Amino acid sequence: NNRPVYIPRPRPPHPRL
Amino acid sequence: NNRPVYIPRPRPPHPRL
Amino acid sequence: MKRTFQPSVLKRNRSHGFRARMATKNGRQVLARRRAKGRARLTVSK
Amino acid sequence: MKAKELREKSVEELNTELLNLLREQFNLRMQAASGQLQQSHLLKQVRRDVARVKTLLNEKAGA
Amino acid sequence: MIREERLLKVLRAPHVSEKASTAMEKSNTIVLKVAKDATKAEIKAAVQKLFEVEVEVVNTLVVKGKVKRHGQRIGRRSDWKKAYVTLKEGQNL
RNA sequence: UAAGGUGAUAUGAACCGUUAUAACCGGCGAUUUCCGAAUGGGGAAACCCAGUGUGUUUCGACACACUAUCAUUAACUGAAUCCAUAGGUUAAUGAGGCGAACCGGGGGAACUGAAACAUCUAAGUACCCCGAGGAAAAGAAAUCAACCGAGAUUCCCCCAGUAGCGGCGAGCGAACGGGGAGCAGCCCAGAGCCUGAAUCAGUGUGUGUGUUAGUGGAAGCGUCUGGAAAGGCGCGCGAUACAGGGUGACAGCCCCGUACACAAAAAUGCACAUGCUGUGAGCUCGAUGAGUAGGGCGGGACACGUGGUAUCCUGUCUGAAUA
RNA sequence: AGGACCGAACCGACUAAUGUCGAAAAAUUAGCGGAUGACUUGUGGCUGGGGGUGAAAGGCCAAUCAAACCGGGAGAUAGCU
RNA sequence: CGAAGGUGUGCUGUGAGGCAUGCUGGAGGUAUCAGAAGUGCGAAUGCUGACAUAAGUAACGAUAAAGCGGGUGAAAAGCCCGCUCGCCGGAAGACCAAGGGUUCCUGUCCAACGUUAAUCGGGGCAGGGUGAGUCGACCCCUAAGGCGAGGCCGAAAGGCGUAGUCGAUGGGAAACAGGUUAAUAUUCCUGUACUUGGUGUUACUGCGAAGGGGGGACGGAGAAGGCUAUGUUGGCCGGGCGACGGUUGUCCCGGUUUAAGCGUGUAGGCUGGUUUUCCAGGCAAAUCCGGAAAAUCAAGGCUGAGGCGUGAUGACGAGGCACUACGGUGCUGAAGCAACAAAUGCCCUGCUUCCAGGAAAAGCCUCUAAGCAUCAGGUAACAUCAAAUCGUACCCCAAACCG
C-alpha cells in the first residue's frame, strides 16, 4: 500500500489544507 | 503582466473643416 | 453573435491533422519546421 | 542464480518459466492489490527471474 | 502456444468498492481490473482457469484517467479497464 | 571496479551485497509495444479491417511469417493478326524518408542606389526545386606568352580601384605576370607479340599505434582570533605534481585530481608485412571523338551593357576540313 | 393555383430610446419587414491573395481588405519628426 | 579585532570627485603606472518591473421578490430542513447531436477562485462512478468531393485523370415493460421476445459470379377518410364531511396504468390472373426481364395504420401498517371500465393535382456463363456455439459549448 505521497511544500498563498 | 494587446480604433474626430 | 470559431473535431483534423499535413509536401515542410523548433504538440489531435 | 538453468534443456526450462508465471507472479500481484503482501521485493525478484529465463529460451532456441 | 501466459497476464487486480461489494452479494458478480485490451474472451478464459469457476458472461468498460494537480505540475492518471465477471449459482471466491 | 546499493523531485517501506554471479562503468548480444518513408488495404497519426502460407486444449478460437510502389535483371505466361510485341505473374537486387551549414545544377525577385526614373545597380543576392559527398566542383592545354619562354585544377598575398566596361551617370572591375600552400598524372575509341607483368579494389592472418571501461600517483604540524580556518605567528617537507575543483574564511603538503609511469578479455580506426579473388604491364603497328567546329537570327556568360567586339554557352535554321 | 393576404416559430434589421472607461469590440427594450419561397437551416465538400466570390457595396474572404494572414529579402528607404 | 554593497556624518578639491569614520553587511577588494571599452541618462507619446494618482470614488452584470422559524457553525440576508410569497411553464421544463473532457456522486477543507459574507459551490484534497448480439460508432454501399497503379501533361516542384480506393449530412439484420444505485442502465436484475452467422444431424434438391433483370428508388402543393398519442366527462374503487354561514349529496379529493413480440389480420391503396408457344433485345448465355401470340377464368395477389386476442389469475397501483442512524426502509395492496373530443403523429415511399419533372450503390429477390454434378453447394427442420472492439458519467438555448 502507498498512503504516503510525499506532499511538496506549497506556495505562500496555498490551500490551508 | 501582458501589455494590452487589442487597442480599439480611436473615436472619429469632430470635423474641423 | 456567431463568433468566427465554431469548433468541429472532424473538420479540424481533416484541415490541420497529421495525415492532411503529410499528404502534400508543404505540409511536410511544416512538420519539419515544427520538429526543428522542438514543439511538444507537433500538430492538432486528440 | 543465472547459470544454474543455463545447462537445462528447453522442455524443463520452458516448464519452470511456466511455473514462475503461474505461481509467485499472478498470486503475488493479487496479494499486493489486496494489501496482504507485506514484502514487495518478491515482485522485483520474480519479474527479473522471468526475464532471465525468457532470454535463455531465445538464446537457446533458434540462434 | 502462448495463449496460456496471455491468460496469466490479462488479469491485473481485483476492484474493491461498495458498489463492487453490493454487486457481489446481490448479483453474484465480481469486478476486477484487467489489461488494457483484455478482450472478453480472454477474461472469461482466464477466470475459468485461475479461479476454477464457471462464469455466465463478462462485460467490460474502460475507465478514463483523472487529471490531477500535483504541486505546480499537471498530470493525468493512466487509463484502465474493469470487468464485471458474472458467476453461476456455484461460486468459490 | 566494488562495500556499498535499489535514477531524480524525495523522505520512507520492503530487500540485495560486503572477497566477490550487490550496484556502478565499457565491449559484444538479446528484447525492442503502437504511430511515423510506414511498406497487407484504408484512415480524422499513435486507429480500423483483411488475404495467403505454416503450427495448435471444447467445431469454438489462437500463434508465427509473408503480402506497398518504383527501377534493373531473370524465369514462366501471353492480346488485337501466324510469328512477334505490348501486357500479366513470380523471384532476386537497389531505391524511398530525415538531417545545421558547406557543394553543383535547374529557376529567380523587389525594396534599394542613381538624391526623380526606364538601360544600369541591388544581384545571379534572398527564396523555391533537384542531386551528391565528407568535402563537392574543377582539372592533365584545340591554354598563356612572346616570337624570350612558361607547362592540369584549386586556394591565399600582390599586380590593382590600374587597363577597361558604363543613361562613360551611379557603379562594376579583370588579365598578363610575380610570391606562396599543395603536387599526379592516366585510360577508351584496337589488333598482334609477350601473359598475374606493376599499380588498385574486395576479403583473411600477423605487427605497430589509436579509440570504447581504468590503475598507481609524492609531501604539515604547533599556537592566536573565530561558530568554523585553508588566515595571522613559528618551525618543516614534496615538486618531471603550486593546472583546476571541493572542503564550516584564502590549502603545493585534508579530499578529488594534475605531472609522471602503467593497463584491454572483447569490438573497432589507421599505418605495414604476408595470402586469396577480380580487373590489369610492356613492345610493334595503326587509329586519334560530325550534325561537331563555323555561319545567319534571338538571348546568356565572360570586368567587357553591341560597341570597332575577340572568346565560351545556348533556342532556332544551316553546315566543313580531318592532318 | 399563387415569388397571393393577415400572423407566431424562424430569417431580417426600418424608427426611437437606452447603452458608448457599456451586460455586449453594434446589444437590449417598445414598435416594424418577409414568413410556400429568388425562402430558411444542419452536416460535409469546392473556389487562395494582383486571386477568389460578389442580385455589384470596392462589399466579403477567421473582430483586419482600393489587394488577407504568417515567415523571409530586412537593420528596405526616410533631403522628415 | 569585518571586503564589496547599503545608510549617515565629518573633512578636502575650481569642477567631474576624493579621503576618513559610525551603523548595517557579510567575503571579497585593489594602490601606482599603463592598456582596452557594451565607459557616465531626465526626457525619445522610449522598453521591462514596482508603486502612486483620481479614490475608498464609479461599479457589484436584466426592476422574476422575497419573509419567518428551526438546524449546523467561531460567525448565517446568501448553506440545509420546514411553512408561506413570487417567476417560467412551445420554457427559464424534459431528452439528444455538435462541442467540452470529470464540470458527475460521497467525504473533507475555506487561503486563492465566486464581483459581498460563506459552514456553500461547476473552488482545493481524497475516494467512488460510465456494464450492450438489439442504442450509436466501427462494419457493408454510395452522393458531392478527395486521393489516384498505369497513363497524359509540365523547367523542377507538380497538375489532371482511368481502373480502383476513400468519403454520412443518405441506404442496410435484431428489445420492450417493470425494478434497483449517493452517482450507470433500452447496458445491471426479473419477465417475455427478436435478428445475423459458424458447426453437426436428418429429409430433399442441381449448384454456381466483379454478369443480366427486378427491387431498393425518392418532387412541390392540396384535400378527404380511417385511427392513435393525448385530454375531458361519467361509472367504479379508496378516503373525507370539515376550525367563519351551508355541505351524506347531482357533495369534495385521489386512483382508474400496462409495452415489444406472437396470432387474426380490418378501413384504405396498387395491379385483371393462370397456362402454352415463339422472338436478331438485356455488349456471351439464360427456365429471369422485355416483346409477340393464342386458350381459359373473371378472380387472385401485393401492401396495410388501428382494433380485437395472447403477452398478463404477471407487473404497476391510491392508501394503510411496522421501525427510523429520524434521510428513509420493510410489509400489504381495492378499482383498473365506458362514452365523447382529437392531432402538425400513423395508414401515406398513399391518393388527387401542378411544372420547375423531382440521388447513387449495396444488402435483398431472381436467371445463367466458366467450372463442378457417387462431390461441393443449396433448401427445410432440430441441436449447439458465436455476435468481437470503441462510446456510455455530467452540461448540452447554458455558470460546463462559441464570445
**Does D61 lie at the interface with E, CB-CB under 8 angstroms?**
no
- As a whole number of angstroms, the distance between CA D35 and CA E21 comes to 17
Helix (H, G, I), strand (E, B) or coil at E77: coil
Residues of A in contact with E70 (CB under 8 A): 8
The answer for C43, left when phi > 0, alpha when psi is -120 to 50, beta otherwise, is beta
Q: Which domain holds residue D14?
A: 2-61
Query: What is C1-46's CATH number?
Result: 1.10.287.3980
Tell which residue, E48, E79, E75, E46, has the closest CA to residue E62: E79
Residue with cell 458472461: E57
Q: E19: domain CATH number? A: 3.30.70.330
D–E contact (≥3 CB pairs within 8 Å)?
A: yes
How many domains are contained in chain E?
1
State residue C19 phi and psi, 5-degree precision. -65, -40
- As a whole number of angstroms, the distance between CA D34 and CA E35 comes to 17
Contacts of E12 (CB under 8 A, 6+ apart): D29, D33, E32, E33, E34, E35, E80
Strand partners, E29: E86
- As a whole number of angstroms, the distance between CA E81 and CA E32 comes to 9
Contact E7, E50 (CB under 8 A): yes
For residue C46, give the amino acid letter.
K
Cell of C36: 526543428
Q: Contacts by E16-25 with C-beta closer than 8 Å and gap 24+?
A: E16/D34, E23/E84
H or E, element range at E11: strand E11-14
Contact E38, E10 (CB under 8 A): yes
Declared resolution, Å: 2.6
How many domains are contained in chain D?
1
Q: Which residues of E43-81 are buried (b: 16+ CB within 10 A; e: fewer)?
A: bbbbbeebbebebeebeeeeeeeeeeeeeeeeeeeeebb
Helix (H, G, I), strand (E, B) or coil at E25: helix
Return the domain boundaries, chain C: 1-46
Q: Which domain holds residue E66?
A: 1-93
Cell of E31: 469486478
- As a whole number of angstroms, the distance between CA B5 and CA A9 comes to 36
Length E73 CA → H25 C1' (Å): 38
Mark yes or no for CB contact D22/E13 under 8 Å: no
Contact D32, D40 (CB under 8 A): yes
Cell of D14: 520452458
Cell of E34: 484487467
Contacts of D5 (CB under 8 A, 6+ apart): D13, D16, D53, D56
Q: By what technique were these coordinates determined?
A: cryo-EM
